[PDB]
DNA sequence: ACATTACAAAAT
DNA sequence: AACATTACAAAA
């Protein structure tokens, strides 16, 4: 009968095996996190553990120690829930192998020579580990007895629909022929698992819930491994990344780990690769019709109400603002009518719109598309105006609809949380136990059941959630297609596909949800945002929650690696060669191959099957590869060569293979060494005869072996080593470690050829929309990091929306340093996955495509943790001296300055547009005032800002910089820093703050309000847009307010009807008529028309009648006259003027108040 | 012309006997129809089985021709299913394989015909002629009826009630019965067959349906184009009735129960809609 | 259905036009009125709302046959027990 | 309320529709067994006696009945006549 | 004119 | 305390 926990009573939890330096590197780093931060905070620890050093052993030992800690806590706490442990990696084979090695470690671990665990302790420990495969493989590994027991125990044995399917699958199982039957068997297994688990969950949810015990419990736990996790029998789970993201079933529902990550531990193997893997699921989401969704929400939120029971306490207030917004939006855009298009070019091609949701907007239409409501036709028509009308644009409508839809989803998340809180209060049960019931209750009260699925997936990817921080990684992108509805030719739909977050945002969400993540990979901290997470964003968002190894810990790891891979002291030499293309060399063997042919071009075109256009390319690839192979054959001691190419040499290029084969034979005869070749060694080949043939040939035959594979074929867990037979090898082998002939004697690849990796941009073959989202995410990530300027990124996005080719995308990508970092990452992984053993030859030959020499020469990181082969490659590349290259940091600084300026430029315009829309909002006034206050208090900041990061740029100088751009023109044309030595300059002196604060009245006001009287010499300084449009206006307004208040003036808040038209309203001596004020910081031309000023005055008087209007300049020359103007801005008598103009309140030469101007203003107020 | 009966075997046998009658009918001792006339007459008769048997009687060449002609040979999700079904076909063992083969045939036929109809509805409509037309008519016997190549159909009662597919949509004979001739064999059992078909309809949630109708008919309007002439007036009494009903029964709130005996057993109501 | 934002009724409408698109009015008979069976029961996943699931028979087989005859179809029913 | 099939059958057996259905089944059974033209000297029909009282109530025109069905009806009616309620009056 | 491919998982 | 069963079609 299964072992219990009462067996570990006499076990000693302080006796541990001698820990390797890697174990200390993990534990010491993880302890300081519990000290500095709390015990409930998550962490992210990337560990650069290279393969073959014992990284799988270290991770499994850490997992076993966590299991023992859980057992000890359970013994001492004699009911807290178990701490969940996850082992996640990309491949299924790696998951299964890691679980097998964990079981082996439990079985065969010894302390001081005695076995660590007894047989019953071993059984108990093994009972806590579970493996979660896909549903088809889960079903196909259950015997017919288990499934019959499950069907009988849940009274599904008599249903016909279920029994017919199960009988069909059982019949298929016995007849498992060639995979032609197996594929259909897998598909049917998946569908049957769907139906069976759905019925089981439905039956367990109701009142007639089956009691699970004994044989039925065992059968259900065999069929549903997640039931073991739910019960508490197991707490360790081995699964893939995609399975982890999707979740797994138990008898109640589908459990999502992402919603329950508080306290869990994740061990992620090959972490940097998961960035791609996660993206795949993020790109598979279902598109939504925005018109249908917004119309449904508006129709159903107009009347339907929640019940006023205590379970729904304070939930309706979460939805009231959304109801107001929906009603206002529906009146604005006339959602009573359906939508259609008309005009030229709008029918042949659907309209495509792309938005990054902040400042990058691209349209497929050549002309701006307008949206007009035709009341006579009762229609909403999409027009093309062949002739700026801000209101009535398709982009505005689409953006607002997207905002409202995402707002509804977020409010649903908040309401689910509130419902859980109330239900916990009443029935005194986790967030997972009330999630589905909360969603169902909320959606059936509102009659919005059609959003059910749309809600669930959202809570998967946004239920994992320091707010006004701006970054692409937690805002995402949106791709909208406007096209005619199916079956009807007079209506259109707006199908939108979203990315609400990036993989880096998902990882940051998991860390911020309380999960401790250990990401193991040798390239875990690579400098790519395409092939790795964005660690700059992760650092900014996590702070000290992103742990790292100190210099001493890194040196300890380096010492351990050198002690297990001692090359220099054992006479192992790495010979690195760079191969250039040789046309005459290839021509020689081409002519010898077919001596009857006239020219080599005829042989390539006719014999090798190479098209004349591509011949040159082949003549570069082949002449290099052969140049390596010959140098391998002439080497006497070498036996095993791996050639890593980009294309598989399968039968599709069979003719080419023959040529290569011919050459090999000739070279063999020229050097009297037998040589065997293995062409087309790919994944499908390994699923067939599985790389054991190469090992057996190396073990039994005294000849060289050349293997032709690709980078994609050599995965993380391929392990290409063979068993050494000392008879066939001479004295060339050397042991580089101190282990006493550990188990079998194995060697690794001895010679390697490396090609330049090519197709370094990710792509998605799931669908066209998934690939579009992947490409747009890559462009936006490159813009976010700073590898692209906003102009380059916008042009690239426009080309991608037009539908360019992959070669042009690759050409765009090759201009970034991210491309070089990805190339070096691929080379590092390739050379690291080939040194997995400790028996080394006399000489290790590395042959490298010469095109990599310029790339590898730019490696600049700390070589403390590089492998020996990679260090040799880098040194050989750098042996050609240094080459002039552009610094990555300064170029990224320029690009990020442009990006921040453009983002602020568009945000200010959008905010001002929303302000000049009566009635205004209150969050908009708050945002405007907060922006002004932040700029006033912190013109420059020392640390990188978090809440207002897009108001500042990082400059090369301290407290000042230079720029050259049109602040009312194109944001993509701004230049910064030394690129514009003579240009508009941003500093403390150009804003005349020092002279202003010298005045006796403004200074006390600035001190009591906390406004800075000077600029700290810091690296973060405001962008030109905020310096010109916001900061100067705030300075002038504050100076005028302080000066007037010193003269017994009162100021009251301007109401939303005339907001931003006038800064303040003035009350003095109780004059019953209203007084309006306008302040300009310094003298500037009145670019706004006099008719515009009259329009503002007329608008004000339309709501408040006659009043007074003051145009005052804060700083200037005080000798200028004081002006009186009419409603038309023409000079008139003081007895009939309505506008009073003050040229200066404080002089610009001595900071002296124009008290005469104030007295004349007082007399003016007395004259009315 | 339709020949309808309950059993598939009777349909197949009746078609076989009609072909035999065409072949072997004589007048005054001389053959009634020549070989060309016999072939023309046989070309007008079509048989409509269920979708699984329709797929399983098409050769791999015909299906490959259809997939190539409609540019579905590269979809993965389509090619994987077809490859699996072909592999099952070439390994036709004891019926333990045959049940699964029939199920997958039905599902694949559904998916393939859906994609074909979607492709034919759009602007990039494939032109059908020659070998592609022959392959499509072999895969879709209803295409012969739609084109006008055939006008006699042998089918079962359930197949007649459900309808059959052509390259455009699913054709329903019941909506196009003006002028047609039906020969129904064993007519008195078609009462039970039709009843069994009628009793399979999907149930509707009345609260959800009425709430949705009330919410959506309150504001939404039809376009005033000539295509919608006098259609809006058909719906005005329904809008007034819906608004009055929702006011009367307070459809802004959701529904629930309370009291004794109302939880253990759900409430069941039966109505003949007149007096029972 | 897309002008009225009522696309979710699509399938239902189709089935209706299958069984009532085949259609002397104030004649009363079970054969063209049918029956209705309604179950009032708690919604799935929530214990504070109910639904009214209704199953209908809008016509009998005799009504279907009469509809086919009145739609212009000539029907020959062959059976020894036809009457 | 959800009664059993036996009670539904008991409800149905009180109608003359039940007797008409019984006779329809008997007629089809005897009709599907005379499909050829070569007949034996004697054709033996053995009938459950519970059918006799039913078959004695056949009243339609025997102009189109098969020979076996006519023989069955005549054999049943050979036991005289039994007092039964008229279908038309009860239906009225 | 660019650059120049293979491989994976969960299935609905 | 009544009455006392097999057979089929279209699938999604």
| Strand F atom within 7 Å of B6 CB | yes
Closest to A292 (Cβ–Cβ): which among C5, C45, C46? C5
How far does the CA of residue C24 sit from the closest CA of chain B (Å)?
18
DSSP class of residue B102 equals: H
Q: What distance in Å separates the CA atoms of residue A673 and residue A634, rounded to the nearest whole number?
A: 9
Evaluate the omega torsion of the peptide bond into residue A919 and state whether it is cis, within 30 degrees of 0: yes
H or E segment to which residue A1109 belongs: strand A1108-1113
Contacts of C81 in chain D (CB under 8 A): 24, 27-28
Q: Please report which residue ranges of A334-477 form alpha helices under DSSP H.
A: 394-426, 435-445, 452-462
A543: left (phi over 0), alpha (psi -120 to 50) or beta: left
Buried b / exposed e across A373-408, counting CB within 10 Å, b at 16+?
bbeeebbbbbbbeeeeeeeebbbbbbbbbbebbbeb
- State whether residue C7 sits within 8 Å of chain A by CB: yes
Resolution in angstroms, to 1 decimal, for this deposition?
A: 2.5
Task: Give residues with Cβ within 8 angstroms of A1066, minimum separation 6.
Answer: A1044, A1049, A1050, A1051, A1075, A1076, A1077, A1108, A1110
Nearest-5° Cα angle at A288, A284 to A290:
150
- Assign A224 to helix, strand or coil: coil
Which residue matches tokens 């008769």?
B45
Question: CB under 8 Å to A15, separation ≥6 — which residues?
Answer: A111
What method was applied to determine this entry?
A: cryo-EM
| Kind plus residue range of the DSSP H or E element containing D68 | helix D67-77
Contact C45 A299 (CB under 8 A): no
In this complex, the chains that touch A, judged by 3 or more CB pairs closer than 8 A, are: B, C
Non-local (6+) Cβ contacts of B159 within 8 A are: B48, B49, B50
Nearest residue in chain D measured CA to CA from C83: D24
A31 strand E contact, CB < 7 Å: no
* Contact flag, residue D10 CB and nucleic strand F, below 7 A: yes
- Tell me, yes or no, if C81 comes closer than 8 A to chain D by beta carbon: yes
| Interstrand relation of A722-723 and A704-710 (parallel, antiparallel or unpaired) | unpaired
Buried b (16+ CB within 10 A) or exposed e, A1059-1068: bebbbbbbeb
Neighbours of A204 (CB within 10 A): 17
DSSP letter string over A226-266? HHHHHHTS--EEEEEHHHHHH-EE-SSSEE-GGGG-TT-EE
Structural contact between residues A22 and A496, judged by C-beta atoms closer than 8 angstroms: no
Contact A708, A647 (CB under 8 A): no
DSSP alpha helix (H) spans, A44-143: 55-76, 92-108, 119-127, 135-140
- Nearest Cα of chain A lies from the Cα of B44 at a distance, in angstroms, of 31
Task: Let me know if A162 is exposed, middle or buried by CB neighbors in 10 A (0-12, 13-18, 19+).
Answer: middle
Give the 3-state secondary structure of residue B83: helix
* Nucleic strand E near CB of residue A748 (< 7 Å): no
Give contacts of C26 with chain B, Cβ < 8 Å: none
CB A267 within 8 A of CB A55: no
CB contact under 8 A, A309 and C48: yes
Task: Using DSSP bridges, classify how beta strands A734-735 and A85-89 pair: parallel, antiparallel or unpaired.
Answer: unpaired
CA-to-CA separations, A939 to A933, A989, A1006, in angstroms, rounded = 10, 13, 14
Angle (CA) A807 A810 A813, round 5° = 155
Judge contact between A939 and A1023, C-beta under 8 A: no
Which chain B residues are within 8 Å of A190, Cβ to Cβ?
none
Task: Extract the tokens encoding A991.
Answer: 């804003």
Question: Which of chain F's bases lie under 7 Å from a protein CB?
Answer: 1-5, 8-12
CB–CB contacts below 8 A, B to C? 156
Place of tokens 């008599």: A158
Separation of CA A891 from chain center: 22
Distance CA A131, CA A125 (A): 14
Are the beta carbons of C60 and B195 separated by less than 8 Å? yes
CA distance C77 to A437: 55
Element of type H or E holding C62: helix C61-70
**Cβ-based neighbour number of residue B21 at 10 Å:** 10
Quote the CA–CA distance of A952 and A206 in Å, as a whole number.
58
Angle at the Cα of A913 (from A909 to A918), degrees rounded to 5?
160
Q: Which two tokens stand for residue B26?
A: 């004589």
Instruction: Protein contacts on strand E: list nucleotides below 7 Å from a Cβ.
Output: 1-12
**Could you tell me the two tokens for A953?**
């740029």
Is A54 annotated as ligand-binding?
Answer: yes
**Is any Cβ of chain A less than 8 angstroms from the Cβ of C2?**
yes
Q: How far apart are CA A936 and CA A1027, in angstroms?
A: 10
Angle at B8 between CA B2 and CA B11, to 5 degrees: 40
> Which residues touch B237 (CB under 8 Å, ≥6 apart)?
none
**Residues in B 126-165 with any Cβ partner in C closer than 8 A:** 161, 163
Closest CA to B206 of B249, B160, B152, B247: B249
Strands A952-954 and A573-579: unpaired
- Compute the C-alpha angle A827/A830/A836, nearest 5°: 140
Question: Could you give the residue ranges of the DSSP H alpha helices within A143-240?
Answer: 144-153, 161-174, 179-205, 214-223, 225-231
Do A172 and B253 make contact, defined as CB atoms within 8 angstroms?
no
Q: Is A1116 left (phi over 0), alpha (psi -120 to 50) or beta?
A: left
Angstrom distance (rounded) from CA A259 to CA A248: 13
Query: Closest Cα partner for B163 from B197, B132, B134, B138?
Result: B197
Q: Using the 8-state DSSP alphabet, how is residue A1153 labeled?
A: B
β-strands B164-165, B170-171 pairing: antiparallel
- Residue A941 phi, psi dihedral angles, 5° rounding: -130, 150
Q: Is any Cβ of chain B less than 8 angstroms from the Cβ of C27?
A: no
- The answer, for B208 touching chain A at a CB cutoff of 8 Å, is yes
Cβ-Cβ pairs closer than 8 A, C with D, add up to 8
Helix (H, G, I), strand (E, B) or coil at B156: strand
Q: Which residues, in sequence order, are CB contacts of A1112 under 8 Å at separation 6+?
A: A1040, A1077, A1078, A1079, A1080, A1141, A1142, A1145
Up-side HSE of residue A1159: CA atoms within 13 Å toward CB? 4
Residue A151 contacts residue A165 (beta carbons within 8 Å): no
Which residue gives the smallest C-alpha to C1' distance to F7? Answer: B7
**Are C49 and B256 inside 8 Å of each other by CB?**
yes
Greatest C-alpha distance within chain A: 118
> Which of A177, A337, A376 faces B221 most closely, judged by CB atoms?
A337
Token pair 């649903």: residue:
A412
User: Which nucleotide's C1' atom has the smallest distance to the CA of B51?
Assistant: F11
- CB of C8 within 8 Å of any CB in chain B? yes
Identify the residue among B110, B207, B219 best suited for mutation to test binding to A, counting A beta carbons within 10 A and taking the highest.
Answer: B219
The region, left, alpha or beta by phi > 0 then psi within -120 to 50, assigned to residue A1067 is beta
Sheet containing strand A640-645, strands side by side: A573-579, A843-849, A751-754, A640-645, A704-710, A675-678
Q: What separation in angstroms does the CA of A363 have from each of A395, A944, B107?
A: 9, 34, 40
Residue in this structure with the two tokens 């197996």, named with its chain if needed: A182
CA angle A80, A86, A90 (to 5 degrees): 165
* Whether the Cβ atoms of residue A440 and residue A361 lie closer than 8 Å to each other: no
Three-state SS at B134: helix
- Alpha-carbon distance of A1150 to A1005, in angstroms, equals 19
How many angstroms separate the CA atoms of B261 and B258, rounded? 9
Place of tokens 């599907």: D32
Other beta carbons less than 10 A from residue B97's beta carbon: 21
- How many other CB atoms are found less than 10 A from the CB of residue A183? 16
Place of tokens 């190549």: B149
Residue A831 burial (CB count, 10 A): 23
Instruction: Say if CB B86 and CB A183 are below 8 A apart.
Output: no
Spatial contact of B165 and C55, defined as CB atoms under 8 Å apart: no
| Binding-site sequence positions of B for Mg(2+) | 185-186
DSSP-assigned letters across all residues of A756-786 = PP---S----S-HHHHHHHHHHHHHHHHHHT
For testing the chain A interface, which of B78, B92, B95, B96 should be mutated: the one with the most A CBs within 10 Å?
A: B96
Distance CA A610, CA A620 (A): 13
The SS3 call for residue D7 is helix
Closest CA to A1079 of A995, A1011, A1123, A1144: A1144
B200 CB-near residues (< 8 Å, 6+ apart): none
Whether chain B has a CB inside 8 Å of the CB on C68: the answer is yes
A167 touches chain B (CB under 8 A): yes
Give the strand pairing for A85-89 and A236-240: parallel
Cβ atoms A703, A726 nearer than 8 A? no
Q: Which has the closest alpha carbon to A1: A153, A141, A150, A124? A: A124
**Is D31 near chain C, with CB under 8 Å?**
yes
- Is the Cβ pair C78, B187 closer than 8 Å? yes
How far apart are the C-alpha atoms of A833 and A1133, rounded to whole Å? 90
Tell me A1062's DSSP state.
B
**Contact criterion met (CB below 8 Å) for A125 and A8:** no
**Closest amino acid to nucleotide E8 (CA–C1'):** A91
Closest residue to F9 by CA to C1' distance?
Answer: B158
Integer-rounded Cα radius of gyration of chain B: 26
CA–CA separation, A445 and A412 (whole Å):
13
CA A637 – CA A627 distance, rounded (Å): 18
A995 in a labelled binding site:
no
State the nucleotide closest to A187 in CA–C1' terms.
Answer: E11
Contacts of A931 (CB under 8 A, 6+ apart): A948, A951, A1026, A1030
Q: A1113 forms bridges with which residues in the sheet?
A: A1080
Residue B29 DSSP SS3: coil
**Rounded to a whole number, what is the distance in Å from the CA of A187 to chain B's nearest CA?**
9
Rounded-to-integer distance, Cα A184 and Cα A196, Å: 18
A191 touches strand E (CB under 7 A): yes
State the Cα–Cα distance between residues A47 and A24, nearest whole angstrom.
12
**A712: nearest nucleotide, CA–C1' criterion:** E6
CA distance readout (Å), A103 to A70, A525, A927: 18, 30, 58
Check the CA dihedral B17-B19-B23-B26 and report its sign: positive
Q: Does the annotation flag A715 for ligand binding?
A: no
How do the residues of chain B divide into helix, strand and coil, expressed in percent and rounded to 5?
Answer: 55, 10, 35
Q: Six-digit token pair at A321? A: 């603002």
What separation in angstroms does the CA of A1027 have from each of A67, A1032, A1035, C37?
Answer: 57, 7, 11, 73
**Cα A288 to chain centroid, rounded:** 22
- Which residues share a beta bridge with B171? B164
**Helical axes A21-36 vs A55-76, angle rounded to 10°:** 50
Selection from A575, A592, A364 nearest residue A483 by Cα: A364
Exposure of A842 by Cβ count < 10 A (0-12 exposed, 13-18 middle, 19+ buried)? middle
Q: How many C-beta atoms surround the C-beta of residue A1124 within 10 A?
A: 17
Q: Give φ, ψ of A140 to 5 degrees.
A: -70, -10
Q: Which two tokens stand for residue B247?
A: 């006011």
């Amino acid at each position: 009968m299964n072992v219990s926990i009462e067996e570990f009573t006499h076990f000693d939890f302080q006796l541990v095996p001698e820990p390797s330096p890697l174990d200390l590197v993990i534990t010491e780093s993880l302890k300081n996190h519990i000290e500095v931060n709390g015990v409930k905070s998550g962490a992210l620890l990337p560990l650069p553990f290279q393969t073959g050093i014992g990284k799988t052993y270290t991770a499994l030992n850490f997992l076993l120690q966590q299991m023992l800690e859980q057992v000890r806590s359970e013994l001492k706490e004699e009911k807290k829930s178990k701490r969940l442990l996850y082992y996640v990696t990309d491949s299924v084979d790696n998951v299964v192998s890691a679980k097998a090695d964990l079981l082996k470690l439990i079985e065969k671990q010894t302390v001081k020579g005695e076995p660590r665990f007894t047989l019953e302790q071993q059984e108990y420990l093994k009972a806590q580990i579970v493996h979660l495969p896909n549903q088809s493989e889960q079903l196909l590994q259950c015997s017919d007895a288990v499934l019959n027991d499950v069907l009988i125990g849940f009274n599904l044995n008599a249903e016909r629909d279920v029994q017919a399917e199960w009988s069909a699958i059982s019949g298929l199982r016995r007849h498992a022929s060639n995979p032609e039957v197996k594929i259909s068997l897998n598909r049917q297994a998946g569908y049957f698992y769907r139906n069976l688990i759905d019925r089981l969950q439905k039956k367990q949810k109701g009142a007639d819930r089956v009691l699970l015990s004994g044989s039925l419990l065992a059968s259900v736990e065999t069929l549903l491994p997640g039931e073991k996790i739910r019960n508490g029998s197991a707490h360790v789970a081995f699964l893939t990344t995609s399975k982890f993201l999707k979740g797994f079933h138990n008898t109640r529902s589908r459990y999502s780990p992402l919603r329950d990550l508080s306290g869990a531990v994740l061990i992620i193997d090959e972490i940097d690769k998961q960035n791609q893997v996660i993206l795949s699921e993020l790109c598979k989401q279902q598109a939504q019709d925005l018109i249908w969704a917004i119309r449904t929400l508006r129709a159903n939120f107009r009347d339907h109400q929640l019940e006023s029971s205590p379970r729904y306490d304070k939930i309706e207030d979460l939805f009231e603002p959304l109801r107001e917004r929906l009603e206002e939006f529906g009146t604005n855009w006339n959602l009573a009518f359906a939508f259609n298009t008309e005009g030229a070019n709008l029918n042949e091609r659907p309209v495509r719109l792309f938005s990054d949701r902040s400042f990058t907007h691209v349209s497929s239409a050549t002309h701006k598309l307008s949206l007009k409501s035709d009341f006579l036709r009762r229609k909403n028509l999409i027009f093309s105006d062949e002739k700026i009308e801000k209101h009535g644009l398709l982009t505005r409508f689409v953006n607002e609809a997207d905002v409202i839809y995402q707002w509804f989803l977020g409010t649903m998340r908040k309401a689910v949380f509130q419902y859980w809180e109330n239900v916990r209060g009443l029935e005194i049960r986790s967030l997972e136990g009330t999630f589905q019931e909360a969603v169902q209750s909320l959606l059936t009260h509102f009659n919005l059941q059609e959003f059910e699925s749309a809600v669930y997936e959202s809570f998967d990817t946004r239920g994992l959630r320091l707010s006004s921080s701006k970054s692409y990684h937690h805002t995402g992108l949106k791709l909208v297609e406007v096209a005619h509805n199916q079956g009807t030719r007079d209506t259109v739909n707006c199908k939108a596909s979203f990315l609400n977050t990036s993989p880096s945002g998902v990882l940051a969400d998991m860390v911020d949800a309380g999960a401790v993540i250990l990401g193991i990979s040798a390239t875990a901290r690579a400098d790519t945002v395409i092939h790795n997470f964005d660690f700059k964003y992760l650092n900014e968002r996590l702070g000290n929650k992103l742990l790292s190894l100190s210099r001493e810990q890194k040196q300890r790891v380096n010492n351990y690696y050198h002690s297990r891979r001692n090359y220099k002291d054992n006479g192992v030499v790495l010979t690195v060669k760079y191969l250039n293309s040789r046309d005459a060399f290839l021509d020689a063997l081409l002519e010898e191959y077919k001596p009857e042919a006239r020219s080599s071009h005829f042989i390539l075109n006719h014999y090798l099957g190479i098209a004349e256009s591509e011949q040159a390319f082949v003549r570069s690839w082949l002449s290099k590869l052969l140049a390596s192979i010959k140098a391998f054959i002439s080497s006497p001691d070498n036996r095993y060569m791996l050639s890593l190419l980009n294309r598989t040499l399968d039968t599709t290029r069979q003719n080419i293979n023959d040529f290569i084969q011919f050459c090999c034979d000739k070279w063999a005869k020229e050097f009297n060494v037998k040589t065997k070749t293995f062409f087309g060694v790919n994944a499908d080949w390994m699923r067939l005869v599985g790389y054991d043939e190469i090992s057996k040939h190396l073990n039994t035959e005294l000849g060289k072996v050349v293997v032709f594979s690709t980078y994609a074929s050599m995965g993380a867990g391929k392990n290409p080593d063979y068993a050494v037979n000392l008879a066939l090898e001479g004295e060339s082998l050397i042991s580089v470690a101190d282990v006493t002939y550990s188990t079998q004697l194995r060697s690794d690849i001895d010679s390697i050829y490396l090609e330049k990796p090519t197709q370094l941009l990710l792509s998605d073959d799931y669908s066209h929309t998934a690939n579009q989202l992947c490409q747009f995410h890559q462009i936006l990530s490159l813009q976010e990091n700073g590898e692209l300027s906003p102009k380059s990124a916008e042009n690239w996005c426009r080309q991608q929306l037009m539908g360019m080719s992959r070669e042009r995308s690759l050409q765009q990508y090759h201009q970034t340093s991210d491309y070089q970092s990805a190339v070096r990452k691929y080379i590092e992984q390739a050379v690291g996955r080939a040194g997995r053993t400790s028996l080394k030859r006399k000489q290790i030959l590395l042959f490298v495509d010469s095109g990599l020499k310029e790339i590898l020469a730019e490696e600049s990181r700390d070589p403390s943790l590089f492998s020996h082969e990679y260090v040799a490659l880098v040194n050989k590349a750098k042996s050609a001296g240094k080459s002039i290259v552009e610094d990555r940091a300064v170029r990224r600084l320029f690009n990020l300055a442009q990006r921040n300026n453009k983002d602020g430029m568009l945000s200010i315009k959008a905010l001002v547009h929303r302000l000049h829309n009566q009635p205004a909002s209150k969050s908009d006034i708050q945002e405007w005032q907060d922006i002004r206050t932040q700029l006033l208090r912190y013109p420059t900041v020392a640390f990188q800002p978090e809440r207002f990061n897009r108001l500042y740029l990082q400059s090369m100088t301290k407290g000042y910089y230079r720029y050259q751009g049109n602040l009312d023109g194109d944001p993509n044309s701004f230049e910064f820093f030394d690129r514009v030595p003579y240009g508009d300059m941003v500093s403390e002196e150009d804003c005349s703050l020092a002279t202003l604060v010298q005045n006796q009245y403004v200074r006390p006001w600035f001190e009591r309000k906390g406004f800075a009287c000077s600029w700290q010499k810091e690296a973060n300084v405001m962008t030109p847009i905020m310096f010109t449009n916001i900061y100067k206006g705030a300075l002038g307004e504050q100076a005028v307010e302080a000066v007037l208040t010193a003269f017994d003036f009162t100021f009251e808040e301007v109401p939303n009807s005339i907001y931003e038209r006038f800064d303040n309203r003035v009350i003095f001596a109780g004059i019953e008529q209203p007084i309006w004020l306008d302040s300009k910081y310094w003298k500037h031309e009145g670019n706004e028309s006099s008719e515009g000023y009259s329009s503002k005055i007329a608008l004000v008087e339309e709501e408040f009648g006659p009043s007074k209007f003051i145009y005052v300049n804060a700083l200037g020359d005080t000798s200028k006259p004081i002006r009186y103007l009419n409603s038309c801005f023409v000079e008139t008598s003081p007895q009939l003027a309505k506008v009073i103009e003050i040229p200066a309140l404080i002089d610009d030469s001595n900071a002296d108040t124009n008290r005469t101007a104030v007295q004349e203003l007082i007399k003016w107020l007395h004259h009315s």
